[PDB]
Design a binder for these strands. Structure first.
Lengths: 83, 103, 96, 97, 91, 107, 79, 97
DNA sequence: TCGGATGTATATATCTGACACGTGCCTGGAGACTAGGGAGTAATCCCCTTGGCGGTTAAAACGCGGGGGACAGCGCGTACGTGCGTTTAAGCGGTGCTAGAGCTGTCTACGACCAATTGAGCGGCCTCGGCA
DNA sequence: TGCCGAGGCCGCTCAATTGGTCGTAGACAGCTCTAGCACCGCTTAAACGCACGTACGCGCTGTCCCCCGCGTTTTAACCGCCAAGGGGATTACTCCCTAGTCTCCAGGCACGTGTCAGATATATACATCCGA
């Protein structure tokens, strides 16, 4: 149907570099990339797990912005601009 | 006359009254409690909007955008401690560089 | 629709600025933030009233919850705002 | 030409500290979200607004963790972040015990 | 007041029969049970509020506890709750 | 009549009526469901059994037969799930887990 | 006043030992005194606010636990 | 004329104070401190002994957590002697300054 | 250094004190009933979202030099652990007062529910100057 | 230099407002007696100073290597547009659930009741650490 494989590479090296520049750091070691990919992976794991549980409780096959904003609010990292 | 007008305020006390009575924060609400709550909310809005309007007009722009709200929040310790874990859409950065980074 | 504060965010600028205007995006952010602060202060007032074994959530409950949330500087200013608002409501009655 | 290493680096820090457009390409992040999601419940659906919110939140979390790990690496008198810096900054924040 | 202090010895006896709680271990255990129950309860409450319902059902508690706990202990708690539910349904 | 208890019907050891009263008292919503207190009692008893088993191990291995908060924090810190749930709690009479950074050790 | 000096050097030394450290710098004493005074100030403010709301003059342990819980770090063994 | 090698006593007292569980700050000084720091918020107050004990326990836990964190910090910079900069870094990463 | 000194878990007799146990009881838990509405179920409709396809182009990949910076070594001088002697004030246990927590009552204004009214800001227009 | 957001216009309808009811939350008064407070003195555990050695924080130096910046090449993100049908959101209605009430009864509670494991202090042998 919609089988998927290896999207973690979507967060490319220059994207991580631009994110770090936004963070305000000059140099970057080569080993930073894969581990920050893993960090993003586990963060998204927790966030979207809470979100999808919220959805399932509502008996909705789709995820809405309210779902993820509630998940993030519970995560101790609230969000604005969406309801 | 309306209570909101009787209070000399700008927020509709009926709205916050309905919110409280719907927010199930208690079984019953006080008489002046919604008035006091509207007052404190109006004061907080006035303060944050002062800060945002300043952080926007100094940028030579006449349209307050969430970037300006981020500037206003991240530039006030009180609002920060109140809204530290907030991540506004189309915002989320404060311009600063550490000392040891510059040559 | 929604029954929120958005019809009032612009009409307070005239008391704080002159020419600036809200963007259709930022107004929703401000509205959501005001709803969030409203909820965060109301739950604190309710928890306080429950702790004191009372069930009514009266003015004094909010007056204490606001200083419990906001520290000294802005807390006392907001407190004084609420107090003078209560005074203006009291002195304005059927007799005016 | 070839600028001395460091000059161009500072430019892309002060520049991105003003604009706020997303730094991660939309489609790859959206596909990654779909991937990490499908394991929990199959063949889900997402409002574009929802995945945009995911991207915003993740960008904020990443930039926060990166400025924190930058502080870390500075404290070690270095100017190059390293995996140990990330690990320390995460342990102090308290998500790895 | 009403709490769980007279129950901790009971549940303990079925797992570590050759043991005994102190006079304060029961107190800290009771406070912990109280606050985690309050956490699960308020989670289920502000969860049912989202779906515009006003009640709180067993399904709400199930979703809340799965949303509040990670995989292993979460699923084990779900199993325990479902077993209790069907047991009550029997009688 | 016939005097049968809901907790007894559930084969549990926690008072389901007590947690029902707690729920209705905490005003978490306007009304509670039938099976909701049953499920809550079940999950609470499972959590209690688990943490008490862990503390009983962490005490009996310590050559003592009396659970004190020290053993409770042993059991909490010695589990990743409990940590993720109770890592933000400071048990009375403390008793931080004993650990030493390997770099501090001598040659 | 000087009452902050009640938290003496060997006290916080043993404290850091339980924390798992081997060496201490002299200025750590003053730094820890400062941060501890800040933490007190905050928790005591919240507790005294709770009490003032309850219209009391003492400070019950219950309101202290309330203040700690609301501050982020809860506390058990006191109900 | 025997004398232990420098450092060993520190390890031994580490093992001790980590195995033990009792408080570490003298009661009356901490109680006097709570008194003098409370009277300015509201004068003429009273304190249940259990309440000041709870303050003591909470403060001990907070300090020991901050200390193990700052120890990790100071280790990360190749040192073994915690310095105030370590405290500032730990507090900033924990997010209260 | 291996052996000797020193801190430490180990074995053994004590009492005592928190804890397992039988006895009334009562108050909260359970049973049964009813009255009313929250929501469970079901059409439905139309919003959006998922699929796809073409260009087109900004962005990512790859490579290459080269310079800055991470890192190992060392030395050196200082700040801190260790230990012993000294002061001090914490903690010990009584002891006495009393302000205030806490429990009971009870009377009163106070706040939810409700019938009736209206104008205020909400829907949709008309039109003008600034944000892009 | 261009066209869309917003000032100014006017008509509506439902949420705010008034008046009123009545059940009750609690404000207030009063009484009790509990625990906190201030103090009394005694013992000594612990804090304080000091001297001393030495472990290491730091600063410097040299090396070697590995990110950056740039140029070129590839690529897939993106944007527009078109389908399309899945389910998000909606209204209607019934029914099955809960709240609340009254009655009834036993699980937990408070009481006294024994009662044996758990902390204490002294002596034992061991783990460890540091000196040739």
């Amino acid at each position: 149907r919609k089988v998927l494989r290896d999207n973690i590479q979507g967060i490319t090296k220059p994207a991580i570099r631009r994110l770090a520049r936004r963070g305000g750091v000059k140099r970057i070691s080569g080993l930073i990339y894969e581990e920050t990919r893993g960090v993003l992976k586990v963060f998204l794991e927790n966030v979207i797990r809470d979100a999808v549980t919220y959805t399932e409780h509502a008996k909705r096959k789709t995820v809405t912005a309210m779902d993820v904003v509630y998940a993030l609010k519970r995560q101790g990292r609230t969000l604005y601009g969406f309801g | 006359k309306t209570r909101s007008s009787r209070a000399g305020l700008q927020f509709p006390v009926g709205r916050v009254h309905r919110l409280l009575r719907k927010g199930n924060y208690s079984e019953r609400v006080g008489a002046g409690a919604p008035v006091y709550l509207a007052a404190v909310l109006e004061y907080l809005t006035a303060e944050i909007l002062e800060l945002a309007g300043n952080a926007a007009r100094d940028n030579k722009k006449t349209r307050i955008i969430p970037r300006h709200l981020q500037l206003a929040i991240r530039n006030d310790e009180e609002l920060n401690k109140l809204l530290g874990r907030v991540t506004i859409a189309q915002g989320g950065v404060l311009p600063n560089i550490q000392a040891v980074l510059l040559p | 629709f929604g029954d929120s504060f958005t019809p009032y965010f612009p009409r307070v600028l005239k008391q704080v600025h002159q020419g600036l205007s809200l963007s259709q995006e930022a107004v929703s952010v401000m509205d959501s933030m005001i709803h969030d602060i409203l909820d965060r202060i109301a739950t604190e007032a309710g928890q306080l009233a429950h702790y004191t074994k009372r069930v009514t959530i009266t003015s004094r409950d909010i007056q204490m919850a606001v200083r419990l949330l906001l520290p000294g500087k802005m807390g006392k200013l907001a407190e004084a705002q609420g107090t003078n608002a209560a005074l203006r409501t009291s002195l304005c009655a059927i007799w005016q | 030409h070839r600028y001395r290493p460091g000059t161009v680096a500072l430019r892309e820090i002060r520049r991105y500290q003003k604009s706020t457009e997303l730094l991660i390409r939309k489609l790859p992040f959206q596909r990654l979200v779909r991937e990490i999601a499908q394991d929990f419940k199959t063949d889900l659906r997402f409002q574009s607004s929802a995945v945009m919110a995911l991207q915003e939140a993740c960008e904020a979390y990443l930039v926060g963790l990166f400025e924190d790990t930058n502080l870390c690496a500075i404290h070690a008198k270095r100017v190059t972040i390293m995996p140990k810096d990330i690990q320390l900054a995460r342990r102090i924040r308290g998500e790895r015990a």
